[PDB]
Amino acid sequence: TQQPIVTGTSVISMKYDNGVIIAADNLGSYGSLLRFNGVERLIPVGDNTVVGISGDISDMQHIERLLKDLVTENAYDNPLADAEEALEPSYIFEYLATVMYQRRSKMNPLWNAIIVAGVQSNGDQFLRYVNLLGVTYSSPTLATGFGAHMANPLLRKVVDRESDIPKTTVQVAEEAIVNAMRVLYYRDARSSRNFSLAIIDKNTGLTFKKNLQVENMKWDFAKDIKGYGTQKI
Amino acid sequence: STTLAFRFQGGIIVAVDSRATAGNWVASQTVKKVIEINPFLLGTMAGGAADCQFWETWLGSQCRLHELREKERISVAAASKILSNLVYQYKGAGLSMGTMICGYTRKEGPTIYYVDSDGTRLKGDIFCVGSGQTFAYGVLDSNYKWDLSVEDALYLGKRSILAAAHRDAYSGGSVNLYHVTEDGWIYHGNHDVGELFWKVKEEEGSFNNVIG
Amino acid sequence: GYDRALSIFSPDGHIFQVEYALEAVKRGTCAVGVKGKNCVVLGCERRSTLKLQDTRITPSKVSKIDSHVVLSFSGLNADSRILIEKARVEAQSHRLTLEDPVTVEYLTRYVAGVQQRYTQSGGVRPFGVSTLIAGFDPRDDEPKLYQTEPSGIYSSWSAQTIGRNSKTVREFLEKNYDRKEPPATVEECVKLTVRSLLEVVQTGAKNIEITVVKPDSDIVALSSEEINQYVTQIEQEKQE
Amino acid sequence: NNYDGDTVTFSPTGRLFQVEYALEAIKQGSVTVGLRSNTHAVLVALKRNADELSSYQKKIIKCDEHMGLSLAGLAPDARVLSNYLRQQCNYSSLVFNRKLAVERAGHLLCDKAQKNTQSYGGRPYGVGLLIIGYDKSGAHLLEFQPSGNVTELYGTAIGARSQGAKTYLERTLDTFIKIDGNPDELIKAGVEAISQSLRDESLTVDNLSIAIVGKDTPFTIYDGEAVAKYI
Amino acid sequence: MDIILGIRVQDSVILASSKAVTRGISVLKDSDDKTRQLSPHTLMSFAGEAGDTVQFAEYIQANIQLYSIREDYELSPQAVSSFVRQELAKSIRSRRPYQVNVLIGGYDKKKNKPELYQIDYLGTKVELPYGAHGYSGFYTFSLLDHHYRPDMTTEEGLDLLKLCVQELEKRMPMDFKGVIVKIVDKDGIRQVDDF
Amino acid sequence: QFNPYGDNGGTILGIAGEDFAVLAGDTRNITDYSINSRYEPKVFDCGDNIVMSANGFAADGDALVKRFKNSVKWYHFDHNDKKLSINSAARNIQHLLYGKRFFPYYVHTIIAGLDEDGKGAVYSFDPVGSYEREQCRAGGAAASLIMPFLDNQVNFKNQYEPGTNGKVKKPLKYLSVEEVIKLVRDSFTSATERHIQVGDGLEILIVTKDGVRKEFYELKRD
Amino acid sequence: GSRRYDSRTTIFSPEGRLYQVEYALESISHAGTAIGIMASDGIVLAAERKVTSTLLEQDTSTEKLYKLNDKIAVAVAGLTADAEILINTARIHAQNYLKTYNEDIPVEILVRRLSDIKQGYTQHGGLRPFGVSFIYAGYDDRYGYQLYTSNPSGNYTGWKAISVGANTSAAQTLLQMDYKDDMKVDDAIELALKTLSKTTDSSALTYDRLEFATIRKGANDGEVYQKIFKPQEIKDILVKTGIT
Amino acid sequence: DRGVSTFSPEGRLFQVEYSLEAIKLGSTAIGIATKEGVVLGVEKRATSPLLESDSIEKIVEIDRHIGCAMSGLTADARSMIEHARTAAVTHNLYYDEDINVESLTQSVCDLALRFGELMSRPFGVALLIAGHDADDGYQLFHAEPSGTFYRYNAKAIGSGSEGAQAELLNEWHSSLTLKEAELLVLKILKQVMEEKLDENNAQLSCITKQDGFKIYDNEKTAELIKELKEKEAAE
């Protein structure tokens, strides 16, 4: 039995024609206090997988160490560690999914929601979710926390089903992700303006973007709003 | 559920309903609440479905192992006590079982043992177990005599379940009848309450509370 | 824990520790079991190099396992106590779970299973003991007599003897015991038992113990004078 | 002599006699052959019988849909080791959703056999194994020895008179390695290889045992009338 | 389980135990014997939590019987009662205690005296001239305080016991379906069939 | 306090024919008022012509299916590639479920296939392992909506022969695979209309002696 | 491994004897003789100390005779250190029985349990047996006055008069010669000392080389008293019987 | 001394090879498998005439569809049978079906090598396990203390095994009837037995799909013994 202390908010992601995009802001909240601002919640594994984690940060750091150790262990007695026997997104996910469910079954969970985004060796897009309960599901768009409520509706307007994936380009997909991050900044009280974004493409590979900012915000209309009903000054 | 079994001149009658509930949701009308342990032993099931079903089939395995080791069919007393000693180990853990081990052996004769999940084990001539046990008792006790014929005893057992199936909201479906003799148990059919009630009402002239 | 495999096979296919345990039985005082038509009698030798004994308190050779079953033995006395204790506990355990006392076959099978377990368990030696288990099953009037031995094998006997000079008394029983007509009465069965011990014992004074077991938990041990009467009667008939 | 009482003792020349005596149990065992191409891997095993009234001892065991082995020596020891492989293959599937590499399979067996050669009380395994499989890096063939030594090969043979089949495969190396996309021809080469280890006896219908795994072929075993094709 | 009484008189101990076994709103049995013979001259009645009662009684019974076989000798009622108390004294600090209250009626053959011991589930032992467990005591003790004499006969004890059962049948809320009466004396244990 | 259970919604349905059996289930996965996936299958081919679904808490559902699939694998290893019969699978699943009697899998399990006489078989399980063979069973969130409809249309309950004065019952008969799929589709469209956790897609697995076939149908996405 | 150095203490010889038990008995046969004699109105325990030195503190010494409880005592023959291990176990066992049944432990029960412990060391555990033989002298209300003996094998037997340790063959012949059933304690005291006096390996039997004890009902009315004799009391009883 | 799990220079386990010598000293047991059933027969070999031969239990039921005969240190077989019976019943509990004869045999043989420095020595007994299942039909297995088991059409174990096996080699064919097999076991037992064969010192049994495993009565076997003697004198 735990209670989360230092927390990370929404992780959002979607599939596009050649790969997957994933994003998450750089905040480490301590309740209502926006305590830590340099927190990286996207963690790459190899050159083909990115694990996005929300929830308790101490448990996130534990998961980082496991993934780091997983890469090391895979390299042992493995001449094809950087080729045919390299770590796949599906391997990394299933490992985490196993751990998450084992921990919930011992009544001592890792208080997180995790999204493993990547590209398989055969070029197929991989995007799957797992959380503290060990619950797993996959979808063309996946999001955690407030992202599930606000980002998914927006991302589903682009990719509403499987057949929309080949029709969606990386430009259109990234634009929707960046828009969703702005909406979350408007409406999620435990979010920050600064965020990281990662693209895993089957052709161009892993592109990790740091220190992005929400921009092109609409605040001007606020000046016209006076009082709460009858005030005209 | 409603289950009964009583001892009489011509052996043992065993009768059960077939309903299974999850709260007010009627989950099944076709549950087998009598377990056939061997040609001379029967076990009735009331309470938690899984608890009864799992541990009474387990009981059957223990009874088989007895007759392999001892080259002799297990006694009704020993069979019941295996089950009672088992549930006693789980006392407090929350098992829910109201069972009756009915059978015949040479040394014992016809015998009935009531065994429940809080460790109670009682030998007796008449028992009714389940949510509708009281309704079954009312009809059974008021019509019971030791000198009942096999035909009348079978009907009284059937009629007592019907009585409970009617009044108890958590009993119904159909009646399963068994008759245990010196030669072993004999199945006396599945009787759907849907047809049985009206057949009994018309022929017997009872159930005048219901709109005919 | 001490793990050593003490009981092991030899090139010729023998387990010497089990066979040396039989030698300990062969050293032990003679014990005999004879079953009649409606009874079983257990006879036991007591060596007479021990005078100044206190027979009130000295452990008796025949031991009650339950009210309806008895156990005598030949071999190591200290080892026998362990088997008797285990058997007595299993007797009460059986009554508790089965709601019925043990059969003589069941009790024998248990004791024999214990003896066997010590022949292939690490860190232990076999029991230097062979037993004669006798009694009557619950609600039964057929006499039962069983034998066990260190190896763990057990079997039923019409009449049997174990211990020192047992081959002599077995020879006697083999020609004197009729399968078609066993000792019809208690007196006949006791006499045949005493006769068989008189082939080996020495004197019929405080050297022979006799215990009679009858149906429905009817067990009694004979006193010196009672046994001496059989000894006196047999010797007078012998001079012929 | 004085240094063969247990596995924990070295001889003066640095030998482990108990490990060598375990190796000897393999030489007494019936011959079995392993060979592979780039697409498929094949096990061929000469089964042995007690007499004409008995059945023929099964030499081949399946470990997963993509991996399995043949045995020579103590069969119960092969059962223990094959069961261990089954679990490890299965652990890899459940936890990582990943088919176990044939190379890791060999490493795991090596380490399991090794622990038995360094500790008091235990004994070495008394069996040799030929593991075949098809994984993400194509077809594979391994040779396991109970000393711990595992070796990846194109082809090999273990058991009594295994030198005959091993010489043949050493000559045929360049031919059978290129039998790609043709199962029956790769088996034929294996059946002709094991034939070089035969004396007085010939390959009959309930004597021969063949197994195969490959690109679009799960690990399957052929016995009885299913091997009559290759005699 | 509810009513268990005990009366020690001049030459015997009389135990009375209710026959009813009730769960819920149903009397499942009206002929239940709430006692076990521990040895030829020692009888134990019991009452308490369902299952625990019999399981405990039979466990004690098996132990006393085992002792009797081992030593070819009958333990005194005092010795048996001390053994029983210790088992309950262990039990109360266990993970799941036996919730069983007992009366041990015995005849000591060495002393030629009847003995009645009352032991509750905590392991609280007392020797008494008359005893009871549960709500029975709230009526029977005061009644016996008045009518009991130490030099009474077994017949006088049975009439005294009838007076208790009548009072209980009058004032107790629950129907306990009468009692099974047993007598323990120099000649062992015997049951009164007509009560 | 940490709550180890959750409700992933959805509903499942099993119907048995004469020489076939179907096991259907919607593809929607939810938590509270949010949709997690519109296509997350929960009806699985487990081998030996046995299809299985464990509806309720998806984590426990997946764990169970995973363990049973593994049980089938080891059954082959230990018993010379013997085919696991549907009755044997059912009993094996009871022990899986009851093994966690004191920390249950929160799922309603249904399996379907063919019995050893080649006839259609459906078995249903409660969370702790009580099981029963039936012609018909719905499980999950919309079971209370679908099940009485099945009683009426599959087992012809409360239906009498016209003009017989409610004396002769409508005779029981096996349904064709075509007629069964009609009932499955209508059951799920009805359930989708009136239950918020049911919708998106319908996936049916049909089992005959020839193997396991699949069919997919769109459902309303609101 | 360690197998090389294992003596295998718990095995049979080809003749069916337990090597270590036999050799432990050989060890005990060199120990100071101890005699127990049971009379109708009490029990005597007499024991010879092993070759005493003149500078040994005699009055505050305990080598042979030990008290188990108020009703039971033992005479030791063999390794003293081994005996004390067993004595503390026996003392505890007696108190467990008293705590359980509120009654003093019957003599045979105590003897059986102590003998069962010895038996264990001959059948399992791979340890050497206890090189000790006991003479138990005690009283209970069932059998009255009782004498037992136990040895390393774990086998125990009851006696009217018995000796353990050195010269038991010669000692047992002398006891068998002069013992009779209607004997009194004071007569048994004389027999015990006379037997030691003849079987001793010393030149002459003196007070400083002896331990002596009686268990009488010589207390006031129906109760048992244990008397462990003081040096001066042994000196007096030795003069009173005319040995010195 | 030396380790329990030691290999000889030839590549065999000393203790397993020595236990095989103990089995050769044991009483003869013969099994014959047919399409109408499997027959199991044993030599009782009473050590003395006072011993009640009906108490000699060398043929044993494992389940209704599986039977067992033994030879060697028969006391060692008790825990092997106990395991087999539990394995058989346990499998029925988990899978609601009879357990395969081969799987049962394999379960028993897994105990065999669980010895060392687990139990202290191998078993000193060989088992003939006969049974029937729906898949492979009527089967006869020979389970050794080496952990190995062979299936046999016919098999003899014990003191007269090599002589009896050579006789079974000639006599066995695939079309043997049950009655023919019964007589064949009696015939071969009478040849290798020391004392003269009769209903008291030899026991027969069989397993059929219909009636399951049955130990024959001494009355039934006696008639088969009489039928056997008449047929041999008839030519």
Ligand SMILES: *[C@@](C)(CO)[C@](*)(O)[C@H](CC(C)C)NC(=O)[C@H](Cc1ccccc1)NC(=O)[C@H](CC(C)C)NC(=O)[C@H](CCc1ccccc1)NC(=O)CN1CCOCC1
């Ligand atoms: C009469 C009818 C009532 O007592 C009979 O006694 C029958 C006995 C027959 C079945 C042997 N008793 C029941 O039907 C019994 C009543 C009951 C239920 C729960 C506890 C005690 C008694 N019913 C059951 O056991 C049902 C049987 C199913 C419906 C076939 N099962 C459940 O209720 C299950 C299991 C409950 C459970 C018990 C112990 C530990 C864990 C769980 N519960 C669920 O399936 C949960 N629920 C169902 C509806 O959907 C939401 C989840």
